[PDB]
Structures are given as structure tokens and as C-alpha cells.
Design a protein around this ligand. Structure first.
Ligand code: NAJ
Ligand code: NAJ
Ligand code: ZN
Ligand code: ZN
Ligand code: ZN
Ligand code: ZN
Lengths: 374, 374
């Protein structure tokens, strides 16, 4: 029996910015009313977790990061109706409370209960379930998956198919759904269109998958790391360009390549300059540019609003525009029905104890997704 | 009689920025192949014409400005098929060539033959039909309606109903169509939604008209000139706010008023700060903000891209997103069938010879549209 008891387990604690994760024993309190304690099975390394280490994505420290994961329900608090002990689950770093104006809106998904806009690093009730060396440790996006056990609010967890392979479908918790939805739900890429995708990591490859599923005729991958090009072509890029190879700015190159601008562009990096470049390279009268990358804390971009007055559309989205709790079980069912592939995103599978090695693979340009296994 | 001959007539020539128009004799060449010479009957004063005087909308000087007008065809050049002498016409400041990628696109209207993006101040053939004091004078947006006679390319004119009242339907050539289309075609305002309209001049009032036609439940007019409020309520504003009345920035006021941000916001002024404020006041997950104002030449705004990443859509449009030559005749037919009103926009009527008085009325805040009659 662990139910109703404090669990002592292993977690990766980030005590301060720009330091390795500390793998050590934490205490995980039992779930309170409407909370779920999960035994983690697999978690991916997303660039957003690295941005917490870099300090470009601000959230209270010390913290248990990790938000792209899957595991099995260990216990439920009073009042929980949507999952049961032994269920396979994906934590939802964007919650779906079902009650707020956004959850009720046909097109909104950025639930007002999210912990991304103004991060507190707590449970919904403003407290933490984690202690380490006698110190309270913050949560991250209501998920905190870099731990053998986490506690999540019910609105931050989805039940998934009992037969799903958790070492793959953890990517539906972030990278796959974010990129794929950015193309199919947020941009609504059209058949025969020309798309430009800036950044060919796990999220950008998932954007390419979505553009190809939507029947784009041309998908131009843009990355400064030419080692990313082969995999981008495998999942649907028709051509790849490295801005470092050109004397002209890449917006000019992409405008000429697309005979006056692309139909859809996607920023999947998190730099202010590429967000402006991505907007500029879409057709000035009817182009659509989607910001997917997380921009650096408290920094403003500079842009000429004439880019919008001619007719461009600029938008961004969290988690691919998916209503998280409705969508994640459906995406897992679609994966089980072979409607899309996740293996092309997975370059490395490491034990959890090698989390730091996994982060160094990402930082060095050598990995797409490392999956950590508990 | 005048067919094939130079016409000497009076025009309002702008010789230099920040000076009154000079009403004096010009020579108007006869139309070349696929050109149409028009006897002007009525023209409106749009803030964009004033921005030419201010130098914030840059176009080559000296120039004959004016782009919101209606008149009667005097003659047609060789090969013209879409109008005849004696037809009532509205010049199209956004052309519709019908051949370019934009014209063929289901959404696009900003035809690649436009003279707004990189203004030359010519006919399509890169030459001028106007001489004054023996000096060639620039055209403006292919229309140049501040003249008793103008010459336009055929792709820059539409035939309208022979019975239409030209002293009213001239507004379909800019202000009404631009504001009304921004709401009904660009934003696609929904029934029961909350809109905010920044700037309550001729184009903002037309945005309100369009929000009311689309069935918005709340239309919040925003202007620093409270004299604009009464007419905004007459055409559908449910409430008006003056930012100068508040201690807090108006995006915060509008967010409070709309219990978390508006469905649709429109910047109909032409200022960088209000373009950012109008984006901020739309709901962060599903809000839509439309730029209608013409921003000051070559100036960039600064904004935080987190405003978009949460889910906002930001876009702009010229001429309300209408394909100009398809749309203008239909808009006149709908006016003739009492589907919308133009009189609320018309505050003042003057003879063409009092054009400077007409610009003084706009600059003082006193007018919405002054209609000049030739
Ligand atoms: N919107 C969301 O919900 C969401 C969730 C997941 C990820 N994120 C963000 O999405 C971005 C991509 O995440 P990821 O795929 O895990 O990251 P990643 O795997 O590091 O991929 C980034 C790619 O960008 C490339 N790159 C870096 N700089 C440039 C440049 N100047 N020009 C062209 N290419 C460049 C880089 O070589 C790499 O292949 C990051 O900012 C994440 O924080 C957002
Ligand atoms: N997109 C297009 O196709 C298109 C064509 C027509 C007009 N325009 C532009 O649209 C804008 C409006 O044109 P218009 O209606 O003729 O102009 P207008 O009659 O001058 O209306 C503008 C309104 O903005 C108000 N205003 C000025 N500054 C502020 C402020 N800081 N905060 C709130 N209100 C303010 C002002 O009091 C006025 O009532 C101008 O920038 C035009 O150049 C664009
Ligand atoms: Zn919610
Ligand atoms: Zn992520
Ligand atoms: Zn065209
Ligand atoms: Zn105008």
C-alpha cells in the first residue's frame, strides 16, 4: 500500500538556473480532493524544459520540471471521477477545467487555470506536494514529470487506452500534439499549399507531419543545423534551407522560392528574429504565420505593422490549439489506429538517471526527442 | 468632342507636404489602351488623403490625391470592355487585375498591381496623365480623384448602377467598404460577440455598422474625442470610452469590461501604440484583432509575442478585404436595396473648390466625411 501515504522516490530537482538536474530522493504527498498521484513510466525532453534551465522560460525555482510524459495512476483523491488507480494517463501541461470562458469557447484551449501565463509553480490550491531535503519544491505547469511519482490536479490529467505504449505516446503530452495541431488546427493548412517550417526539432518535425497530413504540396524546412534536414525530408519536407548558406535574408530567399511568399509559415524555435522572418516570408495579402516557439522572458520584438495591413494573419498557440483533456485520448486512439507515426521523433531512449546526458544531447544538436524511462 | 483630346480642367494639386492643396488648371491626357477617363461627380475626404499631406503615408509628390469617389465615364481607351462612356463608376484604389496570385486566391484582395506597397505615383505603364504648369504630376493609388477629370487603368474602375446617387455611393470607394468589410469579411464578427472599435471616424463608424450587422451583442467605441460618441451609438455602439478618462491603460479597462477580453478588436486610427493596445484587449486564447489604420511610414512597433502564443490572432487588411471590382457594384446594389446606410457618415457637404475647408474640418475633429461635389 502507498495509497494515502507519503511516497519517498527519486526525482530530478533543478535547484537554480544553468545547473545540471540533481537526481535525488524527494517526498511526494498523497493526493488531496480532486488530485491524482501518478507513477511515471516515460518522459520526453522538450526544449521548453531546457528554457527553464536557461532562464528564458521563467517559473519559480527550485522546481521539478518535465511536462511531456505518460504513467499509471497510483491513487486518486476524494471526488476524482475521470481516472482510477491503474489507468494509463498523460499529464496535461495545459489543463481543461471545462468551466472557464476559454474551455467553453469552440476554438480556445488555453484554459484560464493554466500555470504558464503567470507561473506560481503549485497545485491549483496554491500549495506543493513535493519536498526535498526538508524544502518545498515547486511544480512545473501542473505536471512535474521528471519524478518517479507526481501529483496533478484532475483537470491536468487524461485517461488513455490501457494498451498504449507509454514510451511512445508520452510525446502526445507535448511535442507531437503541439506541432501537429499547430499545422492542422491552428493554421488549418490547405491541400496544395506551400509551407515554411522554422526549426526542425521534435515540435517542428511534428508541424511537418501535420502539413503533409493536410496535403501541402511544398514543405520547406528551415534550420541552421543541416544535420536536421534528412529526418525533416523523411517526415515530409520537400526541400530544406540553411539561412547561413545565403548572402540574403532567408525571408527574401523563401519569398523568391515560393514565387511571392508562402501560404503558411511556422516559427518553431523561440527567437524574436525568426518570428519576424517567419511572418515576413508568408504571402503579404493572404499568408498565415503561426508562432509555436516559446519566446525569451520579458523581451519585445520589433516589426512593421504594414506586414499585417496588406492582409497577413499572425497568430500563436499553446499545445497545438488542442482542448487538452478532450484531445489527448483521441490522439492516442488515432496513434493506436496508425493515423500518424511517433518513432521518427525518437532518437534516444535513456534511463531516467541519465536525464542530464539527455539534456546535453538536445543542447548539442544531436537529438530530436530523448525518451527517459523510469 | 473631348474623346482623344487633352482636357484642361481644375484639380487640387499637392506640391509639398504640410501645405494646402492648390486648386488650379491641369492638363489630363486622353486614355491609352485599357484606360478610362472619368468626369468626377463627388469625392470624400479620407484620413489617408490627409496622411499624404502629413507625409506619414508616403507617395511621390507633387501629386493629385483623392481615392474615395464616384463619377461618369467621359471616354475609354482601346480594348476597354468593362465600362462605356456615360456609365457611373467608382475608381478602385485597390485594383483587381483578376490574373495575379492574390486576385485568384479565394480570400486575397491586395492585388499585386496596387500602387500602395511601393508607391510610384503612375498609371500601370509607369507614366502620368497629368501636367500642371508644364510639369508632370503624380497619380495617387491609381485613382487621383481630387480632379474634375482623372484617368485610371481599367483594373482600377468598376461600373455601378446607373441610378445610384454618386454624392452618397462615393463612400463605397473607401471608407464604408473598408470599415464594414473589416468587420464582416476580415474579422468575421459572430452573433452575440463583444467588439472594441478604436477610432470613431468614417472608417470606425463603418466597422461598427458591420459589427452590428453581424449581430455583436456589445460594441465598445474607443476615441479620445468624446464628440464622436453620439454618432457611434446611433450606428450601433452599446458604450463608448475615452482613454483620457482612466488612470489605467485602456487595454486593462476593456479587459475588465469584457470579463477577460473582447472577441474582436479593430484599430481604426493609424497609431503604433493603439495597434498594440487593440491586440492586448482581445481575449488572450481566442481573441482576434484587425489593423485597419494606416501606420506611419517606415516605423516599427514593439510588442511581446506572448500576446500571440496564448492564442490571439492579429491581422490587417486594405479595403475591408473586398476584391474591389467584384465587390463595389454589389455593395452599391445593396445600398440601393437599403441593406446599409451611408448618410450617418456624411456630416458636411462642400463644393470641390473648398477642399482645404474640408481638410480643416477633418483635422479639427468636427467632421466624419465631407463630400466634395464637382
Ligand atoms: N507552443 C507550445 O505549446 C510549445 C510546446 C513545446 C515546445 N515549445 C517551443 O517550441 C520550440 C521548439 O521546441 P523543440 O522542437 O523541443 O526544440 P528543439 O528540438 O531545440 O528544436 C529547435 C530547432 O531550431 C533550430 N534553430 C535554432 N536556432 C535557429 C535559427 N536561428 N534559425 C533556424 N533554426 C534555428 C535548432 O537547430 C533546432 O533544430 C521551443 O521554443 C520550445 O520552447 C512550444
Ligand atoms: N485599411 C484601409 O484600407 C484604409 C482605407 C481608409 C482609411 N484607412 C486608415 O484608417 C484610419 C481611420 O481613417 P478615418 O476614419 O478616415 O479617420 P478619422 O476620421 O481621423 O478617424 C480616426 C479617429 O481616431 C481617433 N483617435 C486619434 N487618436 C486616437 C487615440 N490615441 N486613441 C483613440 N482614438 C484616437 C480620432 O479622434 C478620430 O475620431 C486612418 O489611419 C486611415 O489612414 C485605412
Ligand atoms: Zn478552463
Ligand atoms: Zn513541451
Ligand atoms: Zn491582381
Ligand atoms: Zn481611404
Amino acid at each position: 500500500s502507498t495509497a494515502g501515504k507519503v511516497i519517498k522516490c527519486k526525482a530530478a530537482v533543478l535547484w537554480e538556473e544553468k545547473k545540471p538536474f540533481s537526481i535525488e530522493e524527494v517526498e511526494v504527498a498523497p493526493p488531496k480532493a480532486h488530485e491524482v498521484r501518478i507513477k511515471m513510466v516515460a518522459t520526453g525532453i522538450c526544449r521548453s524544459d531546457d528554457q527553464v534551465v536557461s532562464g528564458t522560460l521563467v517559473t519559480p525555482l527550485p522546481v521539478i520540471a518535465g511536462h511531456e510524459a505518460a504513467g499509471i495512476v497510483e491513487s486518486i483523491g476524494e471526488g476524482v471521477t475521470t481516472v482510477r488507480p491503474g489507468d494509463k494517463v498523460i499529464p496535461l501541461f495545459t489543463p481543461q477545467c471545462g468551466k472557464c470562458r476559454v474551455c467553453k469557447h469552440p476554438e480556445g484551449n488555453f484554459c484560464l487555470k493554466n500555470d504558464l501565463s503567470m507561473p506560481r509553480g503549485t497545485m491549483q490550491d496554491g500549495t506543493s506536494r513535493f519536498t526535498c531535503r526538508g524544502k518545498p519544491i515547486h511544480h512545473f505547469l501542473g505536471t512535474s514529470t521528471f519524478s518517479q511519482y507526481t501529483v496533478v490536479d484532475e483537470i491536468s490529467v487524461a485517461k488513455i487506452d490501457a494498451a498504449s505504449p507509454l514510451e511512445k505516446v508520452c510525446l502526445i503530452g507535448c511535442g507531437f500534439s503541439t506541432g501537429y495541431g499547430s499545422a492542422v488546427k491552428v493554421a488549418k493548412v490547405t491541400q496544395g499549399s506551400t509551407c515554411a517550417v522554422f526549426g526542425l526539432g521534435g515540435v517542428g518535425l511534428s508541424v511537418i507531419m501535420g502539413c503533409k497530413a493536410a496535403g501541402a504540396a511544398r514543405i520547406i524546412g528551415v534550420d541552421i543545423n543541416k544535420d536536421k534536414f534528412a529526418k525533416a525530408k523523411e517526415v515530409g519536407a520537400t526541400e530544406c534551407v540553411n539561412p547561413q548558406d545565403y548572402k540574403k535574408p532567408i525571408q527574401e530567399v523563401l519569398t523568391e522560392m515560393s514565387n511571392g511568399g508562402v501560404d503558411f509559415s511556422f516559427e518553431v524555435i523561440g527567437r524574436l528574429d525568426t518570428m519576424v522572418t517567419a511572418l515576413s516570408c508568408c504571402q503579404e495579402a493572404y499568408g498565415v504565420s503561426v508562432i509555436v516557439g516559446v519566446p525569451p522572458d520579458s523581451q519585445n520584438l520589433s516589426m512593421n505593422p504594414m506586414l499585417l495591413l496588406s492582409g497577413r494573419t499572425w497568430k500563436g498557440a499553446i499545445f497545438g490549439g488542442f482542448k487538452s483533456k478532450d484531445s489527448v485520448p483521441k490522439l492516442v486512439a488515432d496513434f493506436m489506429a496508425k493515423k500518424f507515426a511517433l518513432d521518427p521523433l525518437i532518437t534516444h531512449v535513456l534511463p531516467f538517471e541519465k536525464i542530464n546526458e539527455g539534456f546535453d544531447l538536445l543542447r548539442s544538436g544531436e537529438s530530436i526527442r530523448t525518451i527517459l524511462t523510469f
